Amino acid sequence: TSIMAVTFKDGVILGADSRTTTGAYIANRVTDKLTRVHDKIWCCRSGSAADTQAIADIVQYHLELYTSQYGTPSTETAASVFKELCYENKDNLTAGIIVAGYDDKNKGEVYTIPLGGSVHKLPYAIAGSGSTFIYGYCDKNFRENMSKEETVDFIKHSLSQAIKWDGSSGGVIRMVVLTAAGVERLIFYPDEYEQL
């Protein structure tokens, strides 16, 4: 399952493949992997499904408190709590999570969490099992501060490639736009983007 988060001028758009695979049985063909931990922080899940579901829920207990008492958390702040959980479960679990979020003093930000407990700020991120086939492709077409439309077109294509080349990627390309505008869900069907 390939997932990604890429900055642009007005914010960050998170993209993903919503296929869930146990072996060569598809567990569910759809169903998001874009999981909110906050209104302006959303997260991307890949790897082991179970691990990745549970870990996010724990994080939401922490960031519920965070918002209530001590202000909004930043994208860094949400990532630092994932980073501790993944660090302490370095030897017990494996989770590949991209943290991206939208700010009123940074705009769109990307910090990716590898399978271990590191933290690595990048302005774009690719991860999962499906990502290892589109690394060369995304690299050519990345540029700084795109318009919203180009960003969307770029993510659509890159994820279609991962389905073409990997069986654990699939179903709809969901996108979560995070902007000053608000939150937009976006969905697209296979018929359109197979061509593109």
Partner 1 sequence: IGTGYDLSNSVFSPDGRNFQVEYAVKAVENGTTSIGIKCNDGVVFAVEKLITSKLLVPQKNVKIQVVDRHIGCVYSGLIPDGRHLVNRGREEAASFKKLYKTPIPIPAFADRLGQYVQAHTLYNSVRPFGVSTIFGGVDKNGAHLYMLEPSGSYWGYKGAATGKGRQSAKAELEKLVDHHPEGLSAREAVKQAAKIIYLAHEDNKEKDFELEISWCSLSETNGLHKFVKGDLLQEAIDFAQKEIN
Partner 2 sequence: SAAGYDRHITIFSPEGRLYQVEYAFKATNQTNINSLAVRGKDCTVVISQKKVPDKLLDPTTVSYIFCISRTIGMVVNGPIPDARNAALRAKAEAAEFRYKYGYDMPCDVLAKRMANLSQIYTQRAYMRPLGVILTFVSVDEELGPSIYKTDPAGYYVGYKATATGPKQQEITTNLENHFKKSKIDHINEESWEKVVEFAITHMIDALGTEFSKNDLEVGVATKDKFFTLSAENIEERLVAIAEQ
Partner 3 sequence: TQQPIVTGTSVISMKYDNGVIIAADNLGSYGSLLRFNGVERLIPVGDNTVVGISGDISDMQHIERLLKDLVTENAYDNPLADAEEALEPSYIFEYLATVMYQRRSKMNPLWNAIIVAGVQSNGDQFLRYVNLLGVTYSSPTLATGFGAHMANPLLRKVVDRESDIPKTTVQVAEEAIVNAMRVLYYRDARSSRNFSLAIIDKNTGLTFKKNLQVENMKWDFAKDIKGYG
Q: Which stretch binds partner 2 (CB under 8 A): 64-72, 76-84, 123-131, 167-175?
A: 64-72
**Does residue 60 interact with partner 2 by CB under 8 A?**
yes
Q: Which stretch binds partner 3 (CB under 8 A): 7-15, 66-74, 108-116, 175-183?
A: 108-116
State the catalytic residue, choosing from 1, 21, 52, 77.
1
**Does residue 18 interact with partner 2 by CB under 8 A?**
no
Q: Is 75 a residue of the active site?
A: no
User: How many Cα neighbours within 13 Å face the side chain of 174?
Assistant: 24
**Does residue 90 interact with partner 3 by CB under 8 A?**
yes
Q: Report the partner that residue 81 touches, choosing among partner 2, partner 1, partner 3, none (CB closer than 5 to 8 A by kind).
A: partner 1
Q: Which stretch binds partner 1 (CB under 8 A): 3-11, 38-46, 63-71, 90-98?
A: 63-71
User: How many Cα neighbours within 13 Å face the side chain of 16?
Assistant: 27
**Does residue 80 interact with partner 1 by CB under 8 A?**
yes
Member of 61, 135, 140, 195 binding partner 2 (CB under 8 A): 61
Query: 93: how many CB neighbours lie within 10 A of its CB?
Result: 17
Rounded to the nearest 10 degrees, how much is the dihedral formed by the CA atoms of 113, 105, 72, 93? 0
User: How many Cα neighbours within 13 Å face the side chain of 9?
Assistant: 6
Those residues whose C-beta lies under 8 Å from the C-beta of residue 88, and which sit 6 or more positions away, are 117
Which residues does the chain break after (C to N > 2.5 Å)? none
Least distance to partner 1, CB of residue 73, Å: 8
Q: Report the partner that residue 57 touches, choosing among partner 1, partner 2, partner 3, none (CB closer than 5 to 8 A by kind).
A: partner 2
Q: Which residues are marked as active site?
A: 1
Judged by the rule CB under 8 A, the positions of this chain that interact with partner 1 are 62, 66, 69-71, 73-74, 76-77, 80-81, 83-84, 105, 119
